[PDB]
Paper text:
[name] is the first of two enzymes that catalyze the conversion of decaprenylphosphoryl-β-D-ribose (DPR) to decaprenylphosphoryl-β-D-arabinose (DPA). After BTZs have entered the catalytic pocket of [name] containing the reduced form of the flavin cofactor (FADH2), which was generated by oxidation of the substrate, the nitro group of the BTZs is reduced to nitroso which can then form a covalent bond with a nearby cysteine residue (Cys387, Mtb enzyme numbering). We obtained co-crystal structures of Mtb-[name] with BTZ compounds 1, 2, 9, and 12 and BOZ compound 5.
Compound 2 is the four-electron reduced form of 7, also referred to as hydroxylamino-BTZ, and was synthesized as a potential noncovalent inhibitor control. However, it turned out to be a novel mechanism-based suicide substrate (see later). The progress curves for 2 were also time dependent, which was not expected given that this hydroxylamine compound is the two-electron reduced form of the nitroso derivative, 1. These data could be explained if 2 is an alternative substrate of Mtb-[name] that reduces Eox to generate an ERED:1 complex, followed by covalent bond formation with Cys387. We incubated 10 µM Mtb-[name] with 20 µM of the hydroxylamino-BTZ 2 in the absence of FPR and resazurin and monitored the intact mass of the enzyme by mass spectrometry. This hypothesis was further confirmed by X-ray data (see below) that clearly indicate a covalent bond to Cys387. The orientation of covalently-bound 2 in the active site of [name] is similar to the nitro and nitroso congeners. Therefore, 2 is a true mechanism-based suicide substrate of Mtb-[name] because substrate (DPR or FPR) is not required for covalent modification of Cys387 to occur. Very remarkably, 2 was very potent in the enzyme assay, surpassing its nitro analogue, 7.
Residue numbers in the entry: 7 to 45, 48 to 268, 284 to 319, 331 to 461
């Protein structure tokens, strides 16, 4: 079931024609890899295509669409383990798991992502500072490697090196077929949330450094990257935790695990309204309200700067607002500890996502941003990238050589390849 198809990432740029295999038959997939391994443009897995860049395409090669492998094999409330095919998506998983009092332990800002894509990008969420990234919660996975064998990987077993190279490995160690995830127990589908509004970058940072982060499992902020200082870096901060049944109002206690401008705006009254609106304590909120509040020709850019380099982070934010490039939708968060995966994106520090309209000079400006991010100890996220250079990437990820070595062992013939692997010289 092969079709020549034109593939892009979610950004709809850097287009690339590939032979797309789409089949629910795992044995067909094993044979397609073993076939590619005989004859040399290789293969890469694809999930739901929500990564903005070029990690899920392979120009003139094979792309295996994993979404048809979407069986949930089992869910267990006592062990908190789910056993699922890699093509299962987090929305599907959230729905299926709620009736067991289980919560998907790491959720990104859209639930249309596959488990395979979640592992391969080692995705993070609003709870990174309390929960780590997705890879921290994988207890096993079955990896179809270049030799056509399916390998059972665990984080502390004898194949730990390959497991942790696969986490964050952008599909370049093989095809994740199936995994077991440890879910988070919950008594409800709701959050209890506190809101705070700051008037400056200095305050934003202050709020995230005063120790209050430890009282919240989930935390993120909308961020002003346009206004000149002092307003620059002012934020609507939303923080919280999963509610217990005891904390819900009467109306919702019976089904606790359910799911289902003007002239004033820019002046003093507007400022007061927004400040009041964004300030609250103990507000009960569902998933959409707390986690996806947005449900009511761009360049996506995300970077993190090590915690200690706070002055340097501020400098970068100033560079952005003074650039002449205007990003209105900005997400800020303080990441917590990193994990063992050599290519994992998150590190403890100041994370920000920005979104720039594509216009003259942007390309060259974002290259300079890369340079500053690199210089200040930070990195970019592959899930949001199609334009950075191999030299920059390699310097941002000093464990890349360590990772490349692992990849060479498991794929000596370069059976697995993508546009991204060639661009960033991970091939
Ligand atoms: C609106 C929006 C919000 C987002 N918010 C966040 C966020 O808050 N946090 C965050 O971390 N990310 C976020 N992302 C990025 C997204 O979580 C990742 O890009 C994710 O990897 C996409 O999953 P996918 O199934 O669509 O994978 P694809 O984009 O199809 O593939 C991405 C990578 O995963 C690999 N892959 C997919 N399936 C398999 C498999 N079975 N075996 C091996 N490799 C595989 C591919 O080869 C590729 O390298 C967001 C994206 C969007 C569009
Ligand atoms: N940046 O991609 C980013 C980061 C985080 C983080 F807090 F976990 F770090 C969350 C996050 C999100 O929830 N949603 C994002 N989307 C959807 C809403 C509009 C902008 C893109 S981005 C994001």
């Amino acid at each position: 079931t092969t079709t020549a198809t034109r593939l892009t990432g979610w950004g709809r740029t850097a287009p690339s024609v590939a032979n797309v295999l789409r089949t629910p038959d795992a044995e067909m997939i094993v044979k397609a890899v073993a076939r590619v391994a005989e004859s040399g443009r290789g293969a890469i897995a694809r999930g739901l295509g929500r990564s903005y860049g070029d990690n899920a395409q392979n120009g003139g090669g094979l792309v295996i669409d994993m979404t048809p492998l979407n069986t949930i094999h089992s869910i267990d409330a006592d062990t908190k383990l789910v056993d699922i095919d890699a093509g299962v998506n987090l929305d599907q998983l959230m729905k299926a798991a709620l009736p067991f009092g289980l919560w998907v332990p790491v959720l990104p800002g859209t639930r249309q992502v596959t488990v395979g894509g979640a592992i391969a990008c080692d995705i993070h969420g609003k709870n990174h500072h309390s929960a780590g990234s997705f890879g921290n919660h994988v207890r096993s996975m079955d990896l179809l490697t270049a030799d056509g064998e399916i390998r059972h990987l665990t984080p502390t077993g004898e194949d730990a090196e390959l497991f942790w190279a696969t986490v964050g490995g952008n599909g370049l160690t093989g095809i994740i077929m199936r995994a077991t995830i440890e879910m988070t127990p919950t008594s409800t589908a709701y959050f209890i949330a506190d809101g705070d509004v700051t008037a400056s970058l200095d305050e934003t940072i202050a709020l995230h450094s005063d120790g209050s982060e430890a009282r919240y499992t989930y935390s993120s902020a909308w961020f002003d990257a346009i206004s000149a200082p002092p307003k620059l870096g002012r934020a609507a901060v939303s923080r919280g935790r999963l509610a217990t049944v005891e904390q819900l109002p009467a109306k919702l206690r019976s089904e606790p695990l359910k799911f289902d401008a003007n002239k004033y705006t820019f002046g003093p009254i507007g400022e007061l309204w927004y400040r009041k609106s964004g300030t609250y304590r103990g507000k009960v909120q569902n998933l959409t309200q707390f986690y996806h509040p947005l449900d009511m020709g761009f360049l996506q850019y995300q970077f993190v700067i090590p915690t200690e380099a706070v002055d340097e982070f501020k400098k970068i934010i100033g560079v952005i607002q003074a650039s002449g490039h205007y990003s209105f939708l900005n997400v800020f968060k303080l990441f917590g500890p990193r994990n063992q995966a050599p290519l994992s994106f998150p590190i403890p520090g100041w994370n920000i996502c920005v979104d720039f309209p594509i216009k003259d000079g942007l390309g060259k400006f974002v290259s300079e941003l890369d340079r500053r991010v690199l210089e200040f100890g930070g990195r970019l996220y592959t899930a949001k990238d199609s334009r950075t250079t191999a030299e920059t990437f390699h310097a941002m990820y000093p464990r890349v050589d360590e990772w490349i070595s692992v990849r060479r062992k498991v794929d000596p013939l370069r059976v697995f390849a993508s546009d991204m692997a060639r661009r960033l010289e991970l091939l």
